[PDB]
Every structure is written in C-alpha cells, then in structure tokens.
Amino acid sequence: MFLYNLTLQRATGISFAIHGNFSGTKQQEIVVSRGKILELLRPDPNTGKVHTLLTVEVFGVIRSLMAFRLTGGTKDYIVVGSDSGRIVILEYQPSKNMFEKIHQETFGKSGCRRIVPGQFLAVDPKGRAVMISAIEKQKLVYILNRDAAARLTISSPLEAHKANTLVYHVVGVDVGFENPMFACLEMDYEEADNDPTGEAAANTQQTLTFYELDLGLNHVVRKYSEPLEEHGNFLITVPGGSDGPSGVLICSENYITYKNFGDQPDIRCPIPRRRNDLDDPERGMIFVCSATHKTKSMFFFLAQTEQGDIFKITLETDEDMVTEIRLKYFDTVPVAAAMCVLKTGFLFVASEFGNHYLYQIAHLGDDDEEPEFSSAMPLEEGDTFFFQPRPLKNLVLVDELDSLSPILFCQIADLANEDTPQLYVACGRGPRSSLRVLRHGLEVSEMAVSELPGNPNAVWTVRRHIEDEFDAYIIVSFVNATLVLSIGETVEEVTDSGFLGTTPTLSCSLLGDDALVQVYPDGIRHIRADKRVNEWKTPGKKTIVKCAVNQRQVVIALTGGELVYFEMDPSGQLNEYTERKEMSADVVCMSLANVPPGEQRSRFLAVGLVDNTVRIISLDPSDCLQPLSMQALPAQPESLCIVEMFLYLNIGLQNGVLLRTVLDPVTGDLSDTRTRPVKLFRVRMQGQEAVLAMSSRSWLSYSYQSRFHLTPLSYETLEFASGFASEQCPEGIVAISTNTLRILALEKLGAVFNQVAFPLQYTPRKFVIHPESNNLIIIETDHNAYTEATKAQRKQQMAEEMVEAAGEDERELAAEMAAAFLNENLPESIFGAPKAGNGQWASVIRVMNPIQGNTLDLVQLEQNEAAFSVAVCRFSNTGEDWYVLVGVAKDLILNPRSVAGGFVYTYKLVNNGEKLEFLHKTPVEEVPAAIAPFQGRVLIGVGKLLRVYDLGKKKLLRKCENKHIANYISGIQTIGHRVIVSDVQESFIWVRYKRNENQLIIFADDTYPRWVTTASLLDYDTVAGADKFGNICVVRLPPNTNDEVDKALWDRGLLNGASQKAEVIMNYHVGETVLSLQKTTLIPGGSESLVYTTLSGGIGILVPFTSHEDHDFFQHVEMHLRSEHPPLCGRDHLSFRSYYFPVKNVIDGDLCEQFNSMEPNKQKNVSEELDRTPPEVSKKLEDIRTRYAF
C-alpha cells in the first residue's frame, strides 16, 4: 500500500507577521508565517482588501520571523529562524514572484531543540546586525553589511553564549548610529538546580541584559545587566537616536516599565484593568503583542492586553531621558498573535485563532474625552487604573481573512441533497468559535435576478459599443420567443433596437465597434447602432444552425456544413462570401480564435460535427474553407472556445468532459477534465479571459497562479451564460436558468473551498451526525470559563457587592451605575469572554441544523462540568429510538490532572432529531472520553477502562469491562467484532469481543508510543490514526493471526502486551497536528481517499497508488525535487517528513506540486531523467489530483 499526500487548502493560521517594503516599492507589504508556509500579503491602500501575493511551503517550522532594512536601502529582507538549525535571509523578487535564498547560514542541528538557536530573533534598527538566540545557553550575532554591488554580506557568527541561562525574549535596541545593542530577558536557573529547599526559585529574579556589539572590535560584550522586580514576557524597542529616547519597554504582569541605562530611572506604569471586570481578581494582565509606529515627529506604541484591549503608549520626555509614561485606551480587537501598524493608517490584526482582520486607523485618540493614564500621578500601590471598554471608535473594520485555525473536528458528508459531499468543520476558540460548512468551488454573489416567461435555449449579452463593457441590449432570447432586455442604469425587457425583435434569435454577437451581426433563424442581419438592419439572405432556404462569430469574422453554417464565412469589411455591409461549399455534416460546435482590435482578423477557427469529428484551420484568408488539423474525439464536441494566455483551445464534448489543448496550427496536448452537455462560453474574470461551462455540474476554468483549475461555482445550475458588466458586477456572468435570468459575480480568485460559518458560544470539541434527521449534535467545552447562569449570577453578586462597597451618602449614583453595569452586555466575540478560574469550565450541548444556521436545541450543563465525548446509537432492548450519550468530566483540573469523577448523560433525541430530553445521568469514576456504538450496545472508555454498557431504566448497566488498557482511552473504533482502542500515549489496541461469554479479549497492539488524537478504519485489518505531534500512521494486522484467543499468570505477551503485534505500513509527518481522518470521496465518480484535517487550518488528502509504474514515477519525481528544489528554510524535506518517525510508503506531493512553480530550465533538467516532457510531468501530476478527489 503506497500513498500520495496532497494539500487541498493550506494552513491559514498566522504565527508571526511583519511589515515592510519587501517588493522594494513605496507600498508596505506583510510577511506572515502560517507555520510551515510563508506567505506574502499586500494590503491595498485604496479598496482596503488583502491580496495574498505569494505562498511558499518551506517544509519546516518557522520559529521566528523579523525583517530588517540596511542603512540607505529601500528594500526589506526577511530573516527566518527555523527548526532547520540555519538562519535564512530571503528577498522577495516581484518579477519572478518567488523568494530567493540570499543567505543560509548553518549553525546547529535540526529540530526545535533547547539550545540550537532559531526560537528568538532580533535585528538592529539600522540593520547593522542580527542576533539569533535559543531558549537556553546560546546566542549568535551575525553582522550584516553590503559590498559595492549593493548585495548582502553576512559575517561569521559571533558567540554571545552564557551557560545555564534561559532567554525569555530578545529584541534590538534603537541606540542610533552607535554600537548595536541587544536587549534580553534572562533567568539564571543554576541556583535553583542545586537548591533542594526551593527558596532559590522564589528568589530567582529576571535580568534585563544589554549585550553591546562593538563592530570595529568584532566581539559581543555583556554591557549591562539589571534585576527586575517582576518577570516580564517581552520587550518593545523604543525608537531612539534623533527620533527620540532610546531604551526598552518591558511588558510584564500588570506593569509596563520603561528601562534605560545612564541617568534614566526606570519608569513604572501599571497596566489598566477593565472597570468592573468579570474576571477573577487573582488573575493579571500581560501584553500579548505590540506594534510600534515610528512616525515623522512623534512615535507611539499599540500594546494589546490579554483580553484584547489595545493601549496607545507615549513617553513624555522633556529631555533625552523620559519623565512620564502615558497609556491610553485605543480600541478592542480579538487576541492577536502579531499586530502590524502600517502606513496610511492601517492595522493588520493577525488573530491567533479564527479569522484575521485588517482595520483602518480613523482617529488617534488625543483630543477626546477618554482619560489618559500617567505614571506621574500618585498612587497608593494598591489600586490599579480602570477604563470603560467601549466599541470601535478609532478603528474601522475594512477587511477580514477567513482562517480555519483551529479545526477541532471534521466530517465529510452529503447532508445537503447534492451530488458532492461537504466538509462540516468545527472551528475557532471560545466566543469566536463557529461551525463552518465548506464546499468545493468559488463563491458566487448575485447582483440582479429576474423571472421571464418561457424556457430559454439561446441567450446572449450583446453591447452596442465595444468600448462600453455593459450590454446596451442583451438579447436574452429563447427557442421560440425573444425576451431581449436593454440594460443601462437598469434592465428593461425591450427588443425594439434588435434586428430579431419578437422573432427568436439563436445567436447575437457584436461584429464591430458600432455594429452587431445577429443570425436569427429568419436570417443574418448586421445591424449597427442605428436601424441598419440589412437582413442578408443565407445560401439556401435553411435557417441559422451553427455560428462562429468573433469581433472581426463571422461564419454561419447551415445543415450540411454550408460554411458561409465573412471577414471584416470596412464599410460594414451584411454580405456572404462565395466560398460556400457543403461539408459532410453540420458542425455541432463552431468557434473562432481571439479577435482583438490590434489584429485585423483571428488566427484560428474550429468546426466540429455531431459525428464525433472536429477540424481546426487558420482563420486567415489563405486557409479559408480548407481544414488544416483534425481531431477524432470519441464524443461529439458540444462546444468549443479559445482562451488567450499560453493560449489554449478548450472543446467540451456532448458528455461532461472538456478537453483542453495547447494553441497550435495542429492538435496540442489534450488533457481531459470531467465537468447536460457542456455549453461552454467565454468570460473575462479579473481581466483574464476564461471559460465557463454549464452542465449537470458547472465548471469555470480559472487561472490561479497560471494553473488550469476547473473549479465549479456556488450558484444556480444555469442552462446558458455569457459575460457581462454592470455597476454592481464590473466583471460578471449574465446567465439564464430554466425561466430565470440572473447576474452572478465572484470575489475570491483561487477559492478552493467556500465557507459558510454558523457562530457558537464555546470551543466545540466533537460532533456527530444523526443518521435520520441529518443534524449535528455538537458538544462545546471551554476551560477557564463561566456558564451563562453562573456568569449572570456573578455579575449580580458583583453589583450587590459594589452597592454595599460604596457605603456612604448619595447612593443614587451608585445604584444607577450598578443598573448601567447590569443591563449592558458587551459582545463576547468582540470584547472577549470575561471569564476566569483555573478549575472552572463551561459546557453546552447543541443540536444544530447543518443547512441553515438555526440551533434546534441548546442544553446548558453545570458550572464545573465539561463534555468530552458524544455519540448517537440505537439499542437492542429499546426500539428504534436514537440515543445521544454525552460523556462529561466533573471538576477536571488539567494541570495537574485531578478529576473528581465523571458522568454520562443520556438523551432520547425527541421531535425527530430536533430536541434533547434529559432522561438519566450515569455517574462514572474517570472521564468517559470515548463513546462508540457496538452491536446494539455501547462502548465507553472511562479512563483506562473499556466498558461494554447497555441502556437501563434509570442508569447505564455495565455489561462487560476490560482494564488491560495502559494509560487512558481517547478513542474507540468499531468494525465487525473488532474494537480498536486509542491510548493517550500508547498505540492502537485490538480487542476481540465475543457475544458469547461477554469478554473483551485484547489480541493485538502496535509497538510504538503514539500520542493518538484520533483514529479511522480502512478495512477489517488496517487502521489509520494521527498524533499529538503532527504525524499520521497507518497500521495493519499481519495475515493468519488467530483471533479466537482466550492462565493469565503463565501466559505472557511479546513485550508487556499482546502475543500478536501490529505492523506499521505507513508513517508520515504532516507538520501540523491532525484531529480528524475520514475515508471518503469528495467528487462523485472518482475513487476513495483518506482525508485529514489539521489544527493549523489545513485540509489534506492521501491517495492510494493504483499501479507500480505510477508509484515509481512519482517516487523518482519526489527524489529529484528533494535535491534540485530544496526547501526554503534549509530543512531537509526527507528529514522533515521523518521528524518523529521515518517516512514510509508515501510520496509527498506538496514537494511534487512545486515542480510547476520551479524554473523552466530546472523543469526540463528534472524531467529529462524521467524521459518525459515537463508538460507530460505536469499532466501526470494533475491526473493524480483529478482522477482522485481534487
């Protein structure tokens, strides 16, 4: 069994974000790290949107990311610290649209190691030197300079090592043009290692360390070291030199301290807490991210707290030293992994989970009524600052970026009655969590929809002017009628200006800038913008059958191949040429090539009959009425078209198959893609010419990264379509379904998956699908949280506490502010969940409809109750009722693990999958973490106990139990009699259950400790599964294993387990942790494949190989792309896929799909050893993606 890995959608969560002039122009761009994918994004200053310029899979964990600019330069390079052990300096080339490895300096071993640097990264603000650093012991400084050729020169690494020292955060110091200084937060753990009393850990204070680097002396000196009053998390570089004072801003627990040496005392300002906060008073606020803004005159800092409140920090100096720190509340955004303030007042809030946002900075917050907190005002050192969090005043939301991070559960199912199944994915964390339905295809937004009597068969969008993109009178005709509508500011069904009129027209095309030739079955008239209806008589009495009309040529073919051709005369008279020779049969498809205004005529013309035979000739007058190349297709070509750019001729057959060939005088490389007959038409999507095919399943041959992708559209199944333009739709499609005209427009360019999101309240752990009503039974469990009843009662308790904590005269103001606090409700998804408590939880159960967004039922659990498993099942003792069993841990504290018990709620799922009624609740001793139906009974994993339960009257009856499971059951699978149990640390355990004697007999296991998140079943012997570290393994029982095994003292296993062992037949490191696997088929008519979804927001697939020769070819392709195209971070691809366990029986197609993005000389250099052309290698690479799921 050999597989092949593909990525349908890449990872969308953002770890790091930096801003700078990476393209070298004046506009600023964002570089974001999606984990193992580096992306370059362009925030548009006009429309406010975000365009992803580049995605590169670097095949390694990007542990740090920071950009630097040299002195006097106008371009920004990207410094990447990774798990490769190498520091990589990259430059964006906008001409080739790729990242060039400018520098790759090797210093340590590969992996996220404790002392090999890569985790922490600092730059000098003048770009003179960078410092890479590990968590422990090891800091390296690279001095960066330029030669005379304006290139980049990196020095040898200067060791600034210090053994037995932890690094919290490193950053450069804006000292100006002096010696470059690096600021570190350090901990000295050596005193606490040799102290058994534990007093040293209580007194090991942090040190702010200033490492100076003397460039002339070429060494790193520990210039300054100071103790800190509390442990800080990170540092902000104050812009210094002539721009302002130097020094650092230490962010810490409930305090921010400006610190600088010399005659500067440290200035301490408390972090302001929310006024009447609903969190516990024992907690403290730390800044999660910061974004300095070096303006022309005055700088400021945007520091976001843990709740999500942005604070604007300024420093009142009145000298080179700083006298005051002034914080001020800015706004409230979701919690950001990184914030990037931009020029022209933008702010890219890259949220740590869920969708990212881009806001526009409207105001600064200076001449307003909000109070500004200062460090110079007196305090009693017992009361902090209180601010009232109001909604967005200084920020205007202009864009969002849809991110699937984190995917917590997934299911592939055709719940909507369509042909292809959908991806039902539980996303998000906490109040921003949701459930997203993902469908294949680009999103289509309607502009104007109208209803017309009579089913159309031939409609067109015709404009009276070539320059005017809007159709002046679109001929929306039918087979017998013609409901042509003129479109100006609005569409009105008027057909006075058309030559057809009330007569039906089978074709209406623009033959000139001010003239259009309409070939109705009455005749062909080249009617101009005026009433110049010259109804030219066709050769013979036959009507119009086939039309090949371009902007400079027109061919009308009757029955028998009466190819009446006409070129572009300068006068504009409807005339038919004398070259009208009858062919063997009429052309089912007739098309011409591109006819731009620069060219006098087209270069090609194709006519294909309904007897499965096509011909393509030149459209010039030298090759008129004489074919040049032939095509013996197995099916009759229903339509044909030519799309410019690398032009291609696409012919759609009578079935749902479109063959695309390269533009040539002869037949090119024919690639067939599956897609009612294919009535293909042309359109102008984003300026680029593309083809749209209407069939039983629609298709739109878009060009994303110059790739021919036949992605469908999320719209109504139209019978015909044409390109159109309007005010609401500047580049859209005017289409006709069964008696319904519509205008449809698309927004996203690539759009491999379109998502619709239904919001939730807590973090969704798992959901199951009811097989009868087709609904989703979601469990949402959140740590550190309050249930709504407990949150309301805690708000009431806080109001009752503050009205007596006032305790003086004139309490009307206190009562009215308590009422104003009680009645309001800040949104949890915007202002954060104001919830706290280490032992506290909040869990709900939600039966929800997957089609719409309605929640059918919502059962709110208790305070310290936490749902962790859910299943739906029938029973043998009970009838056809569907029972929902929910496993709940009671008062579970995660660190350290101390569970107070457990419960299993049972519900009868009344009102046909739309309501849960609480029937009973069976208490158990451990967490019932895995619930699975089993042969009419149910299997519950209570800690390390595997219990076969049957449904009783008032409780659940434990009918069988096994306790040879090692640590903790996290998942139970079931096929036939065999039960596959996942341990939290050990591998899958096979249990043979006999219905006789009621015994759960363990008979097999696998010999690897795998922190299995989830499992899946392939057949009776093979089990797939994932890892908590980002791996996917597939294990299989060997043949002729005796499953009928049955004292226990004498009999022993092979190695502390069963006597039979399961062999591993696949292992592959994804790099992003997989939480859902499913053996499904995404497109109908394809073949089954193993789909996995990852916590970073990515969806991938594994495809079995159907032949030895395909496996050998893709093995050789992967071997060549490992060497001739190394990954961008310097990580070895083979060692990255062999991270925790070695790669086995898979071929990574994420590297093999970089063959198309590799340089063409390198492409033919790779492909010459395969004895195939690079088009043939790209055809095989696309064939393995299209013959399986996309």
Partner 1 sequence: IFCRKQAGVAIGRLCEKCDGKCVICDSYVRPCTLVRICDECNYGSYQGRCVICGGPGVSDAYYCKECTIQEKDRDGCPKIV
Partner 2 sequence: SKYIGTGHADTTKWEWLVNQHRDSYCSYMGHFDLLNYFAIAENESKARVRFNLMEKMLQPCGPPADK
Partner 3 sequence: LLIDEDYYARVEGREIISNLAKAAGLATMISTMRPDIDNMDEYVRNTTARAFAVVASALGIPSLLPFLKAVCKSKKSWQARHTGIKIVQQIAILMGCAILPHLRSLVEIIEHGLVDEQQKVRTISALAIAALAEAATPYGIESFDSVLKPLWKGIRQHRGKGLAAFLKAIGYLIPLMDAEYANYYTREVMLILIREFQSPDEEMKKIVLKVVKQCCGTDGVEANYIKTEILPPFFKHFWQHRMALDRRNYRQLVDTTVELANKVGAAEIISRIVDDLKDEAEQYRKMVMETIEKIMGNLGAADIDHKLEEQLIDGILYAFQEQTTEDSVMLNGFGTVVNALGKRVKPYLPQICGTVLWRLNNKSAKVRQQAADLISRTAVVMKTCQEEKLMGHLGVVLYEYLGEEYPEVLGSILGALKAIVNVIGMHKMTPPIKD
**In the complex, least distance from residue 897 CB atom to partner 2, rounded to whole angstroms:** 12
Cβ neighbours of residue 809 under 8 Å, at least 6 residues apart? none
Q: Which does 287 bind (CB under 5 to 8 A by kind): partner 1, partner 3, partner 2, none?
A: partner 2
Instruction: Work out whether 154 is an interface residue with partner 1 (CB under 8 A).
Output: yes
CA 430 to chain centre: 19
1160-1167 vs 1108-1123: helix crossing angle, rounded to 10: 130
Nearer to partner 3 by C-beta: 152 or 893? 152
Among 20, 157, 456, 608, binds partner 1 (CB under 8 A): 157
Residues 425, 436: Cα–Cα separation, whole Å = 5
Residues 251, 840: Cα–Cα separation, whole Å = 28
Instruction: Work out whether 538 is an interface residue with partner 1 (CB under 8 A).
Output: no
Instruction: Work out whether 408 is an interface residue with partner 2 (CB under 8 A).
Output: yes
β-strand pairing of 999-1006 with 1060-1069: parallel
Instruction: Work out whether 352 is an interface residue with partner 2 (CB under 8 A).
Output: yes
As to burial, measured by CB atoms within 10 angstroms (0-12 exposed, 13-18 middle, 19+ buried), residue 817 is middle
Nearer to partner 1 by C-beta: 1 or 217? 217
Nearer to partner 1 by C-beta: 49 or 161? 161
Among 157, 247, 406, 1127, binds partner 2 (CB under 8 A): 406
Distances (CA, A) of 1141 to 122, 698, 867, 1054: 33, 43, 32, 22
Residue 691: closest CA among 725, 644, 727, 631 = 644
As to burial, measured by CB atoms within 10 angstroms (0-12 exposed, 13-18 middle, 19+ buried), residue 109 is exposed
Q: Which does 288 bind (CB under 5 to 8 A by kind): partner 1, partner 2, partner 3, none?
A: partner 2
Q: Which does 505 bind (CB under 5 to 8 A by kind): partner 3, partner 2, partner 1, none?
A: none
Contact (Cβ atoms closer than 8 angstroms) between residue 931 and residue 871: yes
Q: Which does 157 bind (CB under 5 to 8 A by kind): partner 1, partner 2, partner 3, none?
A: partner 1
Nearer to partner 1 by C-beta: 156 or 1106? 156
Instruction: Work out whether 1094 is an interface residue with partner 2 (CB under 8 A).
Output: yes
**In the complex, least distance from residue 1009 CB atom to partner 1, rounded to whole angstroms:** 23
Residue with the two structure tokens 């804006």: 174
Nearer to partner 1 by C-beta: 85 or 561? 85
Residue 169: closest CA among 185, 180, 181 = 185
Q: Which does 528 bind (CB under 5 to 8 A by kind): partner 2, partner 3, partner 1, none?
A: none
Query: What value, to the nearest 5°, has the Cα angle with vertex 1087 and ends 1086 and 1092?
Result: 110
Residue 668: closest CA among 1176, 18, 311 = 1176
Among 10, 19, 63, 440, binds partner 2 (CB under 8 A): 63
Instruction: Work out whether 1039 is an interface residue with partner 2 (CB under 8 A).
Output: no
DSSP 925-940: SS-EEEEEEETTEEEE
Binding track over 689-718 against partner 2, x by CB under 8 A: ------------------------------
Residues 32, 808: Cα–Cα separation, whole Å = 55
Instruction: Work out whether 72 is an interface residue with partner 2 (CB under 8 A).
Output: no
Contact (Cβ atoms closer than 8 angstroms) between residue 123 and residue 66: yes
Per DSSP (E only), the strands in 195-322 are 207-214, 219-227, 232-237, 248-252, 255-259, 267-270, 273-274, 289-293, 300-304, 309-316
DSSP label at residue 124: -
Instruction: Work out whether 219 is an interface residue with partner 1 (CB under 8 A).
Output: no
Q: Which of residues 797-836 bind partner 2 (CB under 8 A)?
A: 833, 835
Binding track over 201-240 against partner 2, x by CB under 8 A: x--x--------------------------x-xx------
Residue with the two structure tokens 């069963």: 1058
As to burial, measured by CB atoms within 10 angstroms (0-12 exposed, 13-18 middle, 19+ buried), residue 780 is buried
Nearer to partner 3 by C-beta: 151 or 963? 151
Rg (CA), the chain: 34
Q: List the alpha helices (DSSP H) in 170-262.
A: 190-193, 199-203
Q: Which amino acid is at 259?
A: K
For partner 3, the binding residues (CB under 8 A) are: 71-73, 126, 128, 145-146, 148, 150, 177-179, 214-218
Nearer to partner 2 by C-beta: 190 or 493? 190
Instruction: Work out whether 119 is an interface residue with partner 2 (CB under 8 A).
Output: yes
Helices (H) then strands (E): counts for the chain: 11, 86
Q: Which of residues 1116-1145 bind partner 1 (CB under 8 A)?
A: 1135
DSSP 142-171: EEEE--TTS--EE-PPEE---SS-EEEEEE
Give the number of other CB atoms < 10 A from CB of residue 590.
Answer: 24
**In the complex, least distance from residue 101 CB atom to partner 2, rounded to whole angstroms:** 22
Q: Which does 874 bind (CB under 5 to 8 A by kind): partner 1, partner 2, partner 3, none?
A: none
Nearer to partner 1 by C-beta: 265 or 1142? 1142
**In the complex, least distance from residue 71 CB atom to partner 3, rounded to whole angstroms:** 5
Residues 821, 792: Cα–Cα separation, whole Å = 12
Contact (Cβ atoms closer than 8 angstroms) between residue 1092 and residue 1102: yes
Among 50, 121, 134, 140, binds partner 1 (CB under 8 A): 140
Instruction: Work out whether 335 is an interface residue with partner 2 (CB under 8 A).
Output: yes
Q: Which of residues 743-802 bind partner 2 (CB under 8 A)?
A: 763, 782-785
Nearer to partner 2 by C-beta: 106 or 876? 106
Binding span for partner 1 by CB under 8 A among 153-161, 952-960, 973-981, 1085-1093: 153-161
**In the complex, least distance from residue 991 CB atom to partner 1, rounded to whole angstroms:** 40
Per DSSP (E only), the strands in 232-383 are 232-237, 248-252, 255-259, 267-270, 273-274, 289-293, 300-304, 309-316, 324-332, 336-342, 346-351, 356-361, 372-374
Q: Which does 1057 bind (CB under 5 to 8 A by kind): partner 1, partner 2, partner 3, none?
A: none
Q: Which of residues 92-131 bind partner 1 (CB under 8 A)?
A: 105-110
Q: Which does 668 bind (CB under 5 to 8 A by kind): partner 1, partner 3, partner 2, none?
A: none
Binding track over 233-272 against partner 2, x by CB under 8 A: xx--------------------------------------
Q: Which does 204 bind (CB under 5 to 8 A by kind): partner 3, partner 2, partner 1, none?
A: partner 2
**In the complex, least distance from residue 218 CB atom to partner 1, rounded to whole angstroms:** 10
Among 98, 158, 192, 899, binds partner 2 (CB under 8 A): 192
1108-1123 vs 1174-1186: helix crossing angle, rounded to 10: 120
Q: What are the residues binding partner 1 (CB under 8 A)?
A: 85, 105-110, 140, 154-157, 159, 1135
Binding site for partner 2 (CB under 8 A): 13, 15, 35, 61, 63, 83, 112-115, 118-119, 134-137, 163, 166, 168, 187, 189, 192-198, 201, 204, 231, 233-234, 286-289, 306, 335, 337, 352-353, 405-406, 408, 429-430, 763, 782-785, 833, 835, 894, 1028-1030, 1071-1073, 1094-1096
